[PDB]
């Protein structure tokens, strides 16, 4: 059972269910939350620190750059993936896992990318939120060694490799669906939900595209066949010669009616 830093951030106390709890030093020494640091000194010390072999870290890097999830994840994510791959290698025979990840299939839809599907607090038609379900609502919820990964990039590459991923709850994950940012200029995807500029081309051109992966290593990723998202309407305006508050004012195009006695900065 490999514990990721997201499990430490969410105070996931799963030391009872798993016995092979191993992780790397820099994923636990980079946490900036003081409550996690206080909780780390109370929990029993069954955790062990080790460094993966260079060969396996390298091969993790080649299929990480094959799967297209290369820039989204960091070096600590590489170390976590290498450690869980090594733990799977020296516990179980290595013939179970596979390489050359499957090509992604195309399946468009007419729904808008900002449709609030599978958000718990809303109701599409029933759909009700009780206090008993607050502990239940963490993510999409459905043997010897597992992973306590939280971010979708590591779960995506693990389910692409066929490695069984675990959660804060007892059971494993069968389906994993989320949103990523795809560029429509240079056709490069990024799973970082907070970024606004692209990686390769560098424009402010990323748009929301949904993804869903399974246990078998099959991935399907949905566009939106709505012309509202892809149009250059509010994108050209003359520029003057050279934080999160006031966010909806920027989303208006400048070439539009504002009130006569108000001013944009």
């Amino acid at each position: 059972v490999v514990a990721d830093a997201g499990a430490f951030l969410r105070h996931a106390a799963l030391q009872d269910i798993g016995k092979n709890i191993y992780t790397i030093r820099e994923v636990v020494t980079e946490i900036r939350d003081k409550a996690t640091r206080r909780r780390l000194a109370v929990l029993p010390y069954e955790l062990r620190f080790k460094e993966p072999l260079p060969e396996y870290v390298r091969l993790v890097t080649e299929f990480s750059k094959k799967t297209g999830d290369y820039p989204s994840l960091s070096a600590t994510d590489i170390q976590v993936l290498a450690l869980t791959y090594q733990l799977e290698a020296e516990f179980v025979g290595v013939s179970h896992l596979k390489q050359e990840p499957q090509k992604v299939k195309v399946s468009s839809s007419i729904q808008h990318p900002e449709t609030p599907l599978h958000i718990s607090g809303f109701h599409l038609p029933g759909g009700w939120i009780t206090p008993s379900n607050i502990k239940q609502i963490q993510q999409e919820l459905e043997v010897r060694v597992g992973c306590l990964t939280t971010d979708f990039a590591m779960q995506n590459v693990l389910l692409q490799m066929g490695l069984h991923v675990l959660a804060v709850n007892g059971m494993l994950i069968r389906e994993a669906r989320s949103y990523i940012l795809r560029c429509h200029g240079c056709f490069k995807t990024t799973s970082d939900m907070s970024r606004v500029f692209c990686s390769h081309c560098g424009n402010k051109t990323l748009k929301k595209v949904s993804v869903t992966v399974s246990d078998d290593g099959t991935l399907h990723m949905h566009f939106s066949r709505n012309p509202k998202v892809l149009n250059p309407r509010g994108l050209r305006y003359s520029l003057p010669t050279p934080s999160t508050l006031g966010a909806g004012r920027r989303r208006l195009n400048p070439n539009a009616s504002r009130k006569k006695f108000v001013k944009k900065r």
Binding site: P116, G121, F122, H123, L124, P125, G127, W128, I129, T130, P131, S132, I134, G248, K259, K260, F261
Partner: protein, 175 residues
């Protein structure tokens, strides 16, 4: 079981969505109530569940969401949850004197002041919270604090300069 629905205008859907977490958490952990938001009717419905604590606080929870619909920040509406002597007063600028067109906009700008400064000053003077809509203005506070803030707002829309109202409201707060 009791239920209550709060409408959401289209200009408040994105603010409601963005900080929905700190909206549904203080209801389900503190008051023990059971909420949802339907998109077909655009309504936030609150109803009591079995593990309800202090049933005669359901209205308070509704007031919570109601304040956030009017434009108040979630901290001030959470203060509306905690304190019991907190009330909401709403009125229009034209509702006390007929101002048309540019006069109405100048009255709005006099209430706000440069950088919102005048409005912000009144808040720290009166320990209230004021959010003013396109023509509507809403004050959140205790009764006498609402009366003081309403006094300052009514004087600013009379045409009194912001400097005089600033000084007089500081002097009244001193008393």
């Amino acid at each position: 079981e009791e239920t209550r629905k709060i409408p959401v205008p289209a200009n408040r859907y994105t603010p409601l969505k963005e900080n929905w977490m700190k909206i549904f958490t203080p209801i389900v952990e503190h008051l023990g109530l059971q909420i949802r938001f339907n998109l077909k009717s655009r309504n936030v419905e609150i109803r009591t569940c079995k593990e309800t604590k202090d049933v005669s606080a359901l209205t308070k929870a509704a007031d919570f969401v109601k304040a956030f619909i009017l434009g108040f920040q979630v901290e001030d509406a959470l203060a509306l949850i905690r304190l019991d002597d907190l009330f909401l007063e709403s009125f229009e600028i034209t509702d006390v004197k007929p101002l048309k067109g540019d006069h109405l906009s100048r009255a709005i700008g006099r209430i706000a002041g440069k950088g919102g400064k005048t409005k912000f000053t009144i808040e720290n003077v009166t320990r209230t919270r004021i959010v003013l809509a396109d023509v509507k203005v809403h004050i959140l506070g205790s009764f006498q604090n609402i009366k003081m803030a309403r006094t300052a707002i009514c004087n600013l829309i009379l045409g009194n300069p912001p400097s005089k109202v600033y000084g007089n409201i500081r002097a009244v707060a001193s008393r």
